[PDB]
Point group: D2
Chain length 121, copies 4
């Protein structure tokens, strides 16, 4: 029924988001893995007038991994598309950059892929 809602990825992380009418994404993210506890703020953007040819809806969002419990000195961005229908899905690739010194910048950024559905594990 749209991007707004509660989503879960293959790791069991929880992505709670609101899609504003003109393209904003606002919500919270809780990771099942990594140097993370509880909810973190997220903000992003999506295409609020997608094509009408069967294409997905492009979108992205960011989490900086600082909250009242922990600070991992890192940030993840997810870039992907929403695919509607009977089992809606958000398919993403992500980049997780840690703050590093300049000599260690070559090893600053992890890459991966997450797929989200509204099915609670």
């Amino acid at each position: 029924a749209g991007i707004t809602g509660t989503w879960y990825n293959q790791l069991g992380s929880t992505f709670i988001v609101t899609a504003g009418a003109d393209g904003a994404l606002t919500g919270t993210y809780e990771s099942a893995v990594g140097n993370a506890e509880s909810r973190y703020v997220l903000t992003g953007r999506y295409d609020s007038a997608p094509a009408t040819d069967g294409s997905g809806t492009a979108l992205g969002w960011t989490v900086a991994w600082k909250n009242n419990y922990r600070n991992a000195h890192s940030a993840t961005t997810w870039s992907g598309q929403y695919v509607g229908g009977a089992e809606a899905r958000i398919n993403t690739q992500w980049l997780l950059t840690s703050g590093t010194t300049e000599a260690n910048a070559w090893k600053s950024t992890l890459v991966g892929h997450d797929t989200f559905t509204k099915v609670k594990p």
Copy 2:
């Protein structure tokens, strides 16, 4: 956050105007020199508002959806990277640009690259 807040440019000639809020928010506008883009687009992101002080960069990211009130490319870019302060301040990034596609074309939906932003004295 005075470091991040300001006007920046990348190696393509694109314009990144940003404000860093006390709460970790990034807000501003982006103008790409290339691609299916014209004029300014809204951006929004997050940064580490209490970064290490041990000679590490400050982790940050932001998103642009490539729709404005003049054009719509049906696509979105996210930049993930770090701010390196000082007199020659830089934001070093890698990015992912996803286009909306049909399911059959989803394998070719996402471009990857890297941008380096230089801050400009206001």
Copy 3:
């Protein structure tokens, strides 16, 4: 029973490979999608003495998309790990670079992810 064998990904592409004793990967790749027809040469490397703690076996390979039928002026590399067991798997991320002019180099490289099993679709 090891890396050597015939593998298929989620697109239905066919990856036929031999793992040499000292780390070579040699074989052919046939893509189900894109500017591709029939088999293409591949070469790569793998860790020929993996850890003994339950970790996967790191590996990578390259295809340049030129054969006797077509030339797409492009190359893909896959980087990932082999995971043995009852349903062995190779989990990868890939980079597909097309030859471009310098002004268009920003849009030269696609990224994605392929998972391979020995199950024939």
Copy 4:
């Protein structure tokens, strides 16, 4: 392929020694300036042996598994990119470095980055 064949260096100070064969093969050795690496490692890859002549680069890629007869990091890097010829020849790449991990740690198995190689007059 005289263009690609030779000795190259990247911005980290690493050494890439390669031979480009008539059949599209790349063979050689790689020496990283950084990471869990010492001495030379075998590489192997492929390139477009009949590239466009319209002012485009030549697509190529290669792999190093980080095991040699002195060290084993249980990891592998692939570089994907293009050769740009002429008097100031470059190979511009992006790379993926996958470490062997347990299944629980697989989400953090892969680093991404970018290297630019400069050819050195033999």
